[PDB]
Amino acid sequence: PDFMSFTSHIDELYESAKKQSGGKVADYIPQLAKFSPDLWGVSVCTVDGQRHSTGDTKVPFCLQSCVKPLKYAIAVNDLGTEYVHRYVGKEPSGKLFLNEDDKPHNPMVNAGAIVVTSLIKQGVNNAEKFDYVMQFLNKMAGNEYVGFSNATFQSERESGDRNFAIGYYLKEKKCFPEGTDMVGILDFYFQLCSIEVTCESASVMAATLANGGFCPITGERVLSPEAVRNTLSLMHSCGMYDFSGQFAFHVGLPAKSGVAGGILLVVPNVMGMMCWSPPLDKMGNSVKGIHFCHDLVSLCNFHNYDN
Amino acid sequence: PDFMSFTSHIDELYESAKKQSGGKVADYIPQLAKFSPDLWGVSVCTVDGQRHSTGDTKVPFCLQSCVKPLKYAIAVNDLGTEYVHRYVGKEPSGKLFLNEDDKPHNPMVNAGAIVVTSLIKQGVNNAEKFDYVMQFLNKMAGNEYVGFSNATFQSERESGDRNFAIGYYLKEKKCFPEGTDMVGILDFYFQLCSIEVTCESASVMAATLANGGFCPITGERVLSPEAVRNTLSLMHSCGMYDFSGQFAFHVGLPAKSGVAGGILLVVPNVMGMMCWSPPLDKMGNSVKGIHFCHDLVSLCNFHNYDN
Amino acid sequence: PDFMSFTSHIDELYESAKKQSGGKVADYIPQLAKFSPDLWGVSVCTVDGQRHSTGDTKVPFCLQSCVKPLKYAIAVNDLGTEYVHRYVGKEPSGKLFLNEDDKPHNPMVNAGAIVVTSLIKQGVNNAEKFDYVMQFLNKMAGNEYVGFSNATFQSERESGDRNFAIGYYLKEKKCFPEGTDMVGILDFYFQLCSIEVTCESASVMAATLANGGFCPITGERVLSPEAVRNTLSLMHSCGMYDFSGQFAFHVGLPAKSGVAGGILLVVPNVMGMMCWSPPLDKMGNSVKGIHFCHDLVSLCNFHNYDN
Amino acid sequence: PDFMSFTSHIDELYESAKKQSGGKVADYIPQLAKFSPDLWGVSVCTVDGQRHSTGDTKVPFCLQSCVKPLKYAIAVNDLGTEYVHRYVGKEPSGKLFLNEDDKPHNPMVNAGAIVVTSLIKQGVNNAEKFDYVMQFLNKMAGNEYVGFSNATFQSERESGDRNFAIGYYLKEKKCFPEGTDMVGILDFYFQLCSIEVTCESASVMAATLANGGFCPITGERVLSPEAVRNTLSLMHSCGMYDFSGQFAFHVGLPAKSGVAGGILLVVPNVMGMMCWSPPLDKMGNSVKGIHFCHDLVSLCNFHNYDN
Ligand SMILES: O=C(Cc1ccccc1)Nc1nnc(N[C@@H]2CCN(c3nnc(NC(=O)Cc4ccccc4)s3)C2)s1
Ligand SMILES: O=C(Cc1ccccc1)Nc1nnc(N[C@@H]2CCN(c3nnc(NC(=O)Cc4ccccc4)s3)C2)s1
User: Fold this and answer.
1) How far is CA D193 from CA D134, D156, D263, in A?
2) Quick one: which H or E segment has residue A300?
């Protein structure tokens, strides 16, 4: 409807969330600790292609866990639901690495994302694999900003002892397809987490998922309907770490958060969004972003089961 | 759109699911073991009021766990989200009785339903409490069949040792509101499970939830929008026992199953349904009903994230 | 050897432990909250019959969990290792009520003691059952003080919601022998916990276990060698609540603590002891008693693996 | 007493256990699968130095987990109870890698042994560390057979994905002393597991523990009394994998089993023993060895709490 009046509300919601100074910027690597707690940006991209931005929407930041639903969508687009879910589950967990079937709980947890990473473009080397994913992300963003943080990659690889423990654990329990270089897969996993985006480019990626796989700025089909439906289902139940259950109840929208302070939000057949503010709460979610998401659903009535 | 052609498809889906002879009729009490495995009925009730039935849709059966979302909707309608969720959670579990906050995981598990039962019409005796719930269920069904099985009630009460263990456990951990007769609450809980419905009357109850709290045959407001949205959210993630996660992924519709073989299904702003076939699978869900639900979403594209 | 010099050391150890004012007297029932934190008594009874007492050794207090190894010894004496352990385990746990075989972990936990209680003198009523156990305890104490607290019994029964939850849970999982009145068994369980002893009489009970089932003051055989060996094994690994593992490592003696502040200690083929001080630590063990036990083993070198 | 008559009983017990053909020889590496299921040897070495052997007592086999109590005894001998237990627990577990304090449950589990390995001779390289342990083992065996299997070492290192997952997990949770080369510690761990012994030499090692740290054939003090007492306590409760609880109850002797089929058994102030038969049961313990241990305690009454 009237997009001009909608932007005035997005600005009001941005201003209300801006007053939330709580949270702690992630500091496990210097590449995250660097960031200012005052950084806050909201970008909207509708299914029709209408754009609106407010705040620090052109400052690049790492996708981190926000890439998990994207690399999962590529795996389903290329291999289908059946092949992918032979290796990874489709529901949240109650932490342990595997479920009762010796499979990672879902693609939104580290163990699940490491296994999904092992399914994408099997056979070729990591350089070709990375280019393949980058090309897919470029199409999803409509050729907008998609970069890479070598400093983040080197730091994640050097300090990722928990991810190496997950790696050897999955190797022991035969979780990867036959003939997988586990360490090479971890390198590719760290590379994908280090991919940089801005609120603006990432809002187009979420808009592609909100428009059934079609990019709203190019009209091009990037992902299959099967891939989008699966990704949105798992974003609705597993996207916000331990807050996933409460986010499904109070917000009810497919979303995915990252340690850099990003929250990739999808409003089915309406719009794509990307909120970003580095200070995270006890669950690891953006404080300003979680506040904004609660206000957006309460104002525009976007909830899955809102009449 | 064309309802006449839609019924032809409902009949085809009914006929396909009829060929599924697997499952085991519940036998923990004689009142359930009595039932024929061949009983199979599907009833539809749209938001506009259009009805269609196929099979054994007039044979009464107990709601059992299908009442859990209904008594939860009454609690939220009368007390609001905040009061209710001080006593019960809003997400599934990974079994234990309480979560990390000494609260039952969600209203769709026995411990959660026992606590919800303790919130409805506090102060009055069980006879007034039961009449209050029956009146609400009558309004939800549009004054259609809502009965009671005294044989089921007596049997559930005499053999419900697990529910008495849950009862004393919740009493020890101070889960009920101050001044609660725990045993009286268990009696009321067993009474609610023993309420009988037919596929036809129960399809109107699910249609009230699909029509934002308005009964499609009376036009009357039965439940508040807050109550309906909460009930549908928890039916989407906790309604099908251990199959809840897989049902959210493959079907993506608010539904609730019972040990009598019933599956109360809701299609938001479209229709209400009730499938019933006594033989249950290893998860405790109706074999014919689960098969029908998968076929319905694959044919009419009713999934939450289907474009 | 020289008993006169040994008593001087027992008095020194008593005086050192007396300075430990920490802990909290149990207050879940008024019958325990009543007790003074300054009460502290140590009684010794050697295998030869030599006695020594220091402090409040004639003030009666409830056995509480200190009765658990005693009622277990009666069950093995009458039914044998094989019959008893068909219903209860023989090792500690990592809380849940049952192990992977749907059996309580060991006889020193509430669920294990409730099941052991259901094996003693089956067939007769609770009045005959209680007299049978009291007669056994009298023989174990050499006809010394063995009383009963009706106030404790009434209070434990009225507030024992956790024990009723355990009771119905064991009934559901078919843990009791066929034809058991679960509620009657709980009544008998509460009665056994309410049996009163003094440090002096209880030291003779521990001396019977230290003298292979023979009472050191009467010379009479009370328990079979099979019963004593089993009881001592389980006291060594399960007797001190969550501190059992640390007590096995640092003290290495068969012991059992109770909520009244008692610690029934056994020194194989040497002596029986009973320490009592109502203030308990975070694990539920007597602060003065735990301190005394560590000092006794460090001074006299009584540890199981001390050369 | 009469050693000549005792050997006749050891031979009878050997012959009875020889008839037990059940079990499966470990096959995760070819170096274990190689072994014959018919291999069976029992060696005795008393505190006085009296020796007796029956069966395949001169065929070398890897210590494997039988080295865990030995390397733990060296750590306590050099660093004391307090320093060692800052890094590792002192009790069994209910599998997870760490306890509630982010410490491995006990030194008899892989995670506990890897951490113990990181405490021995810190500072020097792995070649000096290995020589230090070998020298200690030589003194414990009275200069008898102590060798090394390079084939086992290479195979354990190449296939030890579970141990590498444990390694990175302990590194993430800061379980090792500051400045530890985790991979170098894993190499040393694999080397210690690959040390070879015969029933004869290993019976002298167990006799040193049974003689309070003194080697019965040399009279030399190898381990401190504090080290021996701690090792024996943890062998009594954690030495037989998941059968530890049942072995403590029915046998009640400090013992430690290995995947090669060895069971290092200690009889305090009486004798040291080593039973070996490659076929293992579902718990990972030697079938012939477990049978022999039950018969030995039933015949000679060696149990900890046997009068
Ligand atoms: O613990 C928490 C939360 C928490 C977290 C941190 C600190 C404090 C509390 N909440 C609980 N709620 N209810 C609990 N106990 C129920 C009642 C008895 N029971 C069992 N009795 N026996 C059981 N046995 C098993 O669960 C083996 C099993 C193994 C395989 C297959 C089936 C069962 S559970 C389950 S605990
Ligand atoms: O078990 C199953 C399924 C299953 C079911 C039935 C039979 C067989 C398998 N799957 C697993 N996946 N991953 C597992 N282990 C990981 C790796 C090490 N780890 C921990 N190491 N230490 C831990 N410690 C804790 O979890 C205390 C704790 C307590 C309070 C707060 C935090 C932690 S978990 C967790 S197990």
Assistant:
1) 12, 9, 14
2) helix A287-300
Shortest CA distance from C174: residue in chain B:
B161
Residue C98 alpha carbon to ligand 1 centre in Å = 9
Taking the CA atoms of D195, D201, D202 and D208 in sequence, report the sign of the dihedral they define: negative
Domain ranges of chain D: 1-307
User: Taking phi first (over 0 means left), then psi (-120 to 50 degrees means alpha), and beta for anything else, what does residue D301 get?
Assistant: left
Bridge partners of D273, per DSSP, are D44, D265
Write the residue with the smallest CA distance to atom 15 of ligand 2.
A96
A145: Cα separation from own chain's centroid: 16
Phi–psi pair at B61, nearest 5 degrees: -145, 155
Pairwise CA distance, residues B53 & C65, whole Å: 62
The Cα–Cα gap between C22 and C13 comes to: 17
Rg for chain B, CA atoms, rounded: 18
As a whole number of angstroms, the distance between CA A101 and CA A121 comes to 25
Task: Write the CB contacts of D72 (distance below 8 Å, at least 6 apart in sequence).
Answer: D84, D107, D108, D113, D116, D230, D231, D234
Resolution given for this structure, in angstroms: 2.8
Return d(Cα B37, Cα B25) in angstroms, integer. 6
CB atoms within 10 A of CB A172: 17
Task: Tell which residue, A257, A261, A302, A277, has the closest CA to residue A69.
Answer: A257
Q: Which two tokens stand for residue D241?
A: 């994998």
| A188 CA distance to ligand 2 middle (Å) | 26
C-alpha distances in Å from residue B72, one per residue of B90, B264, D138:
12, 14, 72
φ, ψ (nearest 5 deg) of residue D255: -145, 160
Give CA–CA dist B293/B17, Å, rounded. Answer: 9
**A301 lies within 8 A of chain B by CB:** no
Contact status, residue D249 vs residue D92, Cβ threshold 8 Å: no
CA distance C152 to D47: 53
